Design a protein around this ligand. Structure first.
Ligand SMILES: O=C([O-])C(=O)[O-]
Ligand SMILES: O=C([O-])C(=O)[O-]
Ligand SMILES: [Cl-]
Ligand SMILES: [Cl-]
Ligand SMILES: [Cl-]
Ligand SMILES: [Cl-]
Ligand SMILES: [Cl-]
Ligand SMILES: [K+]
Ligand SMILES: [Mg+2]
Ligand SMILES: [Mg+2]
Lengths: 216, 216
C-alpha cells in the first residue's frame, strides 16, 4: 500500500507556514500578520535521510530552516481547530532549505517564492515519527548543528499559531490529502550553508538526522 | 492505478508559468522577465469536469485564466529542450482560477501567491488529451465563454516561451514526476466571474469543457 514510514515516496503535497516564531520574524525584520504566510513545495522537494541537499545553480546564498513537520492521516477539508489532531498521522523533522538572495528579490519585485523555497531537495526530512511518540508537540526542542556547531534552537511552545489552528487554517484554503505534510516554521538563527557542509538536526528525545550539501 | 485519462486523481504536482502571452502582460502592466514566472498549485486544486469551481470565503474578486496544460509521461530531471516532447504524455485544457484582489496585495507586500493562486479547485481541468491528438501545440486556439459570451481567445503561437523550453527550464529547477502537469499561461481578456456563472472553454477541434461557479 502507501506506508506512513515512507510517506515522502507517495505524499502529493507540502505546505509551509511563514512567521510562526517571533524571534525569527525579528531576525528578518518582516512583520507578523493576523494570519500565517503559506507557500508550497513540490513532492520532489523531499530529500529523505541518505539523499544529500543540492544547491541549485542559481543559488548564491543557501540557508537552513529547521521546522517541525505535521503529516496527515485522512482527507481534510475545513477541519475544525478542535478536531485537527484527529486528522494527524504523525510528524517528521524537516529543513525548509531556502535561496535567501532569490527570496529577497522575489519579495522586492512581488513574485512567487518558488525558486527561493520550492526547488528539488528543498525539503530534507527525518524518519516518520508516529503520533503516540509525541504526547505534546508544543513541548519540543528543535536544534540544528553545522559541522558540529549549533546555529538554531527553539521550543515549539514559541509557536505564534498552534498546530491545530494551522491544520484548520490551511484545510480551509487547501484540502489536505492522506500523506500531505505541513512545515510549521523555523525559530531564530537561520543562516548560510556552503558546499560540503555537514548538517545535523533533531527533536530532543525523539529523532535526529544528518544531511550533506552538494551542487548541480 | 495510474490511468492518464484520470491523471488528476493521482498526479502529485502542478506548475504554472506567468507572463507567457504579451497581450496578457500588457493587460496587467506587469513587465516580462528573461525567464518565466513559476508558482505551484496543490494536487487538491484539480476540479475535474463534473466538479464546480468554488469561490473561497476570502475571495472578493475571482478571475478566469484559460491555459494549455502539458501532462508528463516519465520522471524528468534536467530534461534537454531538444528532448522535452519525448517526456510529454498529453495535454489538458485548464483554468488558472485566481483571487486577483489577494494577488494584488501578495505582490505589494512581497508575499507568496498561494492564497491568490493555490486554493482548492483553483485548477479546473478538461478530459485528458493524448499527444497523438495534438500534432502541434503552438498552432492551437484557446477560447473561454461566460454565460454564452466570449471573454478570452488567443493562439498558442503567441507563447513568449515555447513548451519544450518550459519542460526543460522547469525540470532544471523542480524534478517532474509521471502525472505532473504544467500550465503554460493565459492570453488577453482575463476578468471577473461571480456566483452561479456558467463557464465554457475549449481548444478548437480538440476539446471543450463546462464548469459552474459555487461558494463555500
Ligand atoms: O518564512 C519562513 O519560511 C519561516 O518563517 O519559516
Ligand atoms: O500571470 C499569470 O498567471 C499568467 O500569465 O498566466
Ligand atoms: Cl540564493
Ligand atoms: Cl509562491
Ligand atoms: Cl558533523
Ligand atoms: Cl480576491
Ligand atoms: Cl497558434
Ligand atoms: K504538489
Ligand atoms: Mg520557513
Ligand atoms: Mg496564469
Amino acid at each position: 500500500t502507501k506506508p506512513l514510514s515512507r510517506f515522502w515516496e507517495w505524499g502529493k503535497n507540502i505546505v509551509c507556514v511563514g512567521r510562526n516564531y517571533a524571534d525569527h520574524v525579528k531576525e528578518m525584520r518582516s512583520t507578523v500578520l493576523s494570519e500565517p504566510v503559506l507557500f508550497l513545495k513540490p513532492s520532489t522537494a523531499y530529500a529523505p535521510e541518505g539523499s544529500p541537499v543540492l544547491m541549485p545553480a542559481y543559488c548564491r546564498n543557501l540557508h537552513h530552516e529547521v521546522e517541525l513537520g505535521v503529516l496527515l492521516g485522512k482527507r481534510g477539508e475545513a477541519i475544525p481547530e478542535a478536531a485537527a489532531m484527529d486528522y494527524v498521522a504523525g510528524y517528521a523533522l524537516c529543513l525548509d532549505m531556502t535561496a535567501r538572495d532569490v527570496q529577497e528579490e522575489c519579495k522586492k519585485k512581488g513574485l512567487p517564492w518558488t525558486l527561493a523555497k520550492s526547488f528539488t531537495s528543498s525539503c530534507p526530512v527525518s524518519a516518520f515519527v508516529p503520533k503516540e511518540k509525541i504526547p505534546d508537540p508544543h513541548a519540543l526542542r528543535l536544534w540544528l548543528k553545522v559541522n558540529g556547531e549549533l546555529r538554531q534552537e527553539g521550543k515549539t511552545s514559541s509557536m505564534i499559531f498552534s498546530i491545530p489552528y494551522i491544520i484548520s487554517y490551511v484545510s480551509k484554503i487547501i484540502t489536505l490529502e492522506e500523506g500531505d505534510l505541513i512545515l510549521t516554521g523555523t525559530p531564530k538563527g537561520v543562516g548560510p550553508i556552503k558546499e560540503n557542509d555537514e548538517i545535523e538536526a533533531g527533536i530532543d528525545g525523539v529523532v535526529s538526522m544528518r544531511f550533506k550539501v552538494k551542487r548541480s
